[PDB]
Write a protein that binds this ligand. Structure first.
Ligand code: HEM
Length: 291
């Protein structure tokens, strides 16, 4: 398939900035969510999940068609817990009905990161809603109980290399696991709602113990009360991964630059942007607009 981006008819930057502003203001306002974590984390996860079903082999899946909106994808077990991100976005959509779904879902991840103090992520509009039959089957999202080879192999399907994988994993600093959703439980550090290189620092600095949890799954638990999934821990088991983890742990800026590029790439996978398409936008945060 070819999925050409097509700008929402007659909309420009300022139109997008408004959807952004709306998501942002609601993030501010719904700060009680998940014990005061806020909805940031879950939106980031949502944008990753709708993008992660992509398959470089046949160009199927990916963010383009907003298929997450269909039952099949919505009900994907790997998507448990995402319905909250959805519900949060719904009223926004209602307010700006001309925005396509893939555009909205993805724009929320961007807003989330930036509002949580992360780096600015350039973003492009143009995703087009596609039919229910374009919905990818379940099983395209990664499992958490594996190792580094698994992770490397998986991400290759999305054209991400080693540096991209590690950068993107740095998002694991945010939110937490929820028993009922994934069978894992616990936060991965202390500033779980601010975007920093904490993830890397925790992986290198804590004294991790392997143990089973109440869902009878294994996780790496630290004394401070943090946890790491196997796939997370595997970043220190692989030598190639580990040197990159070290770099980010030592330089937040580098990490921010690499994340930013990787995230965009991840959200733009499988989409063709015509030469005449507008450049990527860089949205101002609420704070830069004095709002
Ligand atoms: C090997 C790859 C990954 C796997 C196996 C993994 C698996 C998981 C699991 C099991 C959860 C917790 C679900 C819950 O019970 O609520 C989680 C949380 C989350 N994931 Fe990943 N994930 C992966 C990669 C990523 C990447 C690439 C991103 C974004 C770049 C992402 C961002 C997050 C976010 C921000 C959270 C927190 C969600 C919340 O607090 O609700 N993860 N991930």
């Amino acid at each position: 398939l070819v999925h050409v981006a097509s700008v929402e008819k007659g909309r420009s930057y300022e139109d997008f900035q408004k959807v952004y502003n709306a998501i942002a203001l609601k993030l501010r306002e719904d700060d009680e969510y998940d014990n005061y974590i806020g909805y940031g984390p879950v939106l980031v996860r949502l944008a990753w999940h709708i993008s992660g079903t992509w398959d470089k082999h046949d160009n199927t899946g990916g963010s383009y068609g907003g298929t997450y909106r269909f039952k099949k994808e919505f009900n994907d077990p790997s998507n448990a817990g995402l319905q909250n991100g959805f519900k949060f976005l719904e009223p926004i959509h209602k307010e700006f009905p001309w925005i396509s779904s893939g555009d909205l879902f993805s724009l929320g991840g961007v807003t989330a990161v930036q509002e949580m103090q992360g780096p600015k992520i350039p973003w492009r509009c143009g995703r087009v809603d596609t039919p229910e039959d374009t919905t990818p089957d379940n099983g395209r999202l990664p499992d958490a109980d594996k190792d580094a080879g698994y992770v490397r192999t998986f991400f290759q399907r999305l054209n991400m290399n080693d540096r991209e994988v590690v950068a993107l994993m740095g998002a694991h600093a945010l939110g937490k696991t929820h028993l009922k959703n994934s069978g894992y439980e616990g936060p991965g550090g202390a500033a779980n709602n601010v975007f920093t290189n904490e993830f890397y620092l925790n992986l290198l600095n804590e004294d991790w113990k392997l143990e089973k949890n109440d869902a009878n799954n294994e996780q790496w638990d630290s004394k401070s009360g943090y946890m790491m999934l196997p796939t997370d821990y595997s970043l220190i088991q692989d030598p190639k991964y580990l040197s990159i983890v070290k770099e980010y742990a030592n330089d937040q800026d580098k990490f921010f630059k690499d994340f930013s590029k990787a995230f965009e790439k991840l959200l733009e996978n499988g989409i063709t942007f015509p030469k005449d398409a507008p450049s990527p936008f860089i949205f101002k945060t609420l704070e830069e607009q004095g709002l």
